[PDB]
Amino acid sequence: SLSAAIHRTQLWFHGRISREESQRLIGQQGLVDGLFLVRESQRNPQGFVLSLCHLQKVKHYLILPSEEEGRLYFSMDDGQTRFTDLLQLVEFHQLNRGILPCLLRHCCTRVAL
Amino acid sequence: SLSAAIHRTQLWFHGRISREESQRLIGQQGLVDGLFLVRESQRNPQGFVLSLCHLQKVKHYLILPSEEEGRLYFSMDDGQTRFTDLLQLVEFHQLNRGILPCLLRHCCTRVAL
């Protein structure tokens, strides 16, 4: 019912928050293996960062935009693996590791459901 | 690149926040006609609320789950107009007023961008 109501809302996305902020929020949600969020990058404000808990360590993956044949894509591996938006990136990594040490299993949010 | 990235993130959903906090956030973002958000009700554990600014006043429209014959829908008018989830409702009202005093024009984002 809640699940159904909010099924297509993307609670993993945090917008313009810091690296430190992401580690705090993740740290306080238990350092759960596979816990994650996406946010805007500080060091590169045109990009995004996937912040991911694995083995109680928090890791950050820079997501950069590029363009090819008039279409924009995002990549955290210098263009080897490409996505049309962050949602496609997140959905792919919920089932496949790719470069990551684990799946994206648990959304880290600051929303109360 | 941001709107290409956050395409399908549905930043209008805020989860459970008070009536006053909704009004605070709407005000903070400028009290534009058609500025809106969807939250969870503080009073009804299973209800949602569309909070929408028209003519410098915030109004609140309850969105309720209904289950008819093992099928779930959401509605703001006791099932005259039915929706599978919150996104369906929002997208319909971005184009059609329905029971509302204006269109849903501007997302009151749950995150800074």
Residue numbers in the entry:
A (entry chain C), B (entry chain A): 420 to 532
Please give sentences taken from the publication describing this entry.
Human growth factor receptor bound protein 7 (Grb7) is an adapter protein that mediates the coupling of tyrosine kinases with their downstream signaling pathways. Members of the Grb7 family share a conserved multi-domain structure comprising an N-terminal proline rich domain, a Ras-associating-like (RA) domain, a plekstrin homology (PH) domain, a C-terminal src-homology 2 (SH2) domain and a region between the PH and SH2 domains termed the BPS domain. The interaction with upstream tyrosine kinases is predominantly mediated by the SH2 domain, which recognizes specific phosphotyrosines.
The monomer fold of the Grb7 SH2 domain is typical of the SH2 domain family, forming a βαβββββαβ configuration. The βF strand, observed in other SH2 domains, does not form in Grb7. We have shown that the Grb7 SH2 domain adopts the classic SH2 domain fold excepting, as also observed for Grb10 and Grb14 SH2 domains, an extension of the βD' and βE strands resulting in a longer DE loop. The BC loop is held in this conformation by a complex network of hydrogen bond contacts formed with a sulphate anion that appears to mimic the phosphate moiety of the natural ligand. Analysis of the molecular surface of the Grb7 SH2 domain indicates that it lacks this classical +3 binding pocket.
